[PDB]
């Protein structure tokens, strides 16, 4: 369950224009950012350092800077031959989930290109010609890289992620109670209204917003995506269409609420 990883976006527009951007993630929780231009790590939280020495993190920040620039440099060098393959986007996802497992997934135009398996760069089974070409150079031509990538995902990432979890102890395990309300909205139908039940500003993400027609829980409502808020909390809304005045309620179940669940009554009940 405990997964730390970095993400990279390499946008290649034309012969000259090409940029790179990264982030440091602890599952859905962003822990780090990358100053694309300057080549400087952004520590989002107090605990983003984890346990790592600044002499360490600086050397890491440095290696990242060289790579973030070099990958673009080396990519635009190969792309200098076929100015037709422009534009395109490279995507990188690499880290570990703690025995501990490390990883390095690469995508091209938002489709898996290659992976890092043991010490072998392995093409995603599909586009052979581009992957097989890249993979070759990675496996037999850029000499330092493979051992470094191996080390980062298997030695550094687990050492770091362990530190980061003991670092963010209070923040990563915090419980934020939801702010829940009801709402009316004209539906497309004659004598039909929508019943929006909201549950906002809650953390951790696992939540259960349900609409009840008196006694039974009603499947057949419009459940939304559990969406993000700038603060870090989550938001959900479940819509229930009702005909011109139909005694119903909304039960909201969150990890935070102490064995209890919020109940929200819309209008009158008639037992």
């Amino acid at each position: 369950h405990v997964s730390f990883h970095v993400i990279q976006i390499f946008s290649f527009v034309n012969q000259s224009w090409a940029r790179g951007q990264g982030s440091g993630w602890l599952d859905e929780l962003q822990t780090h950012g990358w100053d694309s231009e300057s080549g400087t790590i952004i520590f989002l939280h107090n605990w983003s350092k984890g346990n790592f020495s600044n002499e360490e993190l600086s050397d890491l920040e440095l290696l990242f800077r060289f790579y973030l620039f070099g990958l673009t440099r080396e990519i635009q060098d190969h792309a200098s031959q076929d100015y037709s393959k422009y534009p395109f986007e490279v995507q990188v996802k690499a880290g570990c989930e703690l025995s501990p497992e490390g990883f390095f997934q690469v995508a091209f135009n938002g489709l898996d290109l290659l992976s890092f398996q043991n010490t072998t760069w392995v093409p995603s089974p599909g586009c052979g010609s581009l992957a097989q070409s890249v993979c070759h150079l990675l496996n037999h031509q850029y000499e330092g890289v493979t051992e470094t990538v191996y080390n980062l995902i298997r030695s550094t990432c687990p050492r770091f992620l362990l530190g980061l979890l003991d670092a963010g102890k209070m923040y990563v395990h915090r419980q934020v109670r939801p702010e829940a309300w009801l709402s009316s909205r004209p539906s497309l139908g004659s004598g039909q209204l929508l019943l929006v039940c909201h549950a906002s500003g809650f953390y951790p993400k696992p939540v259960w917003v349900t609409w009840m027609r008196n006694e039974q829980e009603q499947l057949g409502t419009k459940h939304g995506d559990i969406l993000p808020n700038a603060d870090g909390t989550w938001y959900l809304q479940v819509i229930l269409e009702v005909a011109s005045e139909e005694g119903l309620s909304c039960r909201v179940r969150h990890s935070s609420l102490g064995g209890q669940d919020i109940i929200l009554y819309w209008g009158s009940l008639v037992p």
């Binding site: 534009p87 091209f108 938002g110 309300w181 709402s183 500003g201 969406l227 938001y235």
Partner: protein, 99 residues
Amino acid sequence: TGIQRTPKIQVYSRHPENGKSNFLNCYVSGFHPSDIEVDLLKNGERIEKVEHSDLSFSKDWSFYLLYYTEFTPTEKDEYACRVNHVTLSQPKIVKWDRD
């Protein structure tokens, strides 16, 4: 040889009152490529000084961003989110509903 996805715009508020300060959230999901133009609107005028997420992508490599501005709603005010992308033939205005 790649993918092109249209953005999925979703508009909501950080809290539920007129005159009482809130936050308007515009969440743009699963799009390909990253080149996107997300705008926030107050009665159709492009809202300036509006902070956003660092670009990230879902398991399936489709991108996403959360857009937000500290706002104060009133009865006569209309808030929406305008997104334009290469997959979109013309911008997509998505109205923030209330009531």
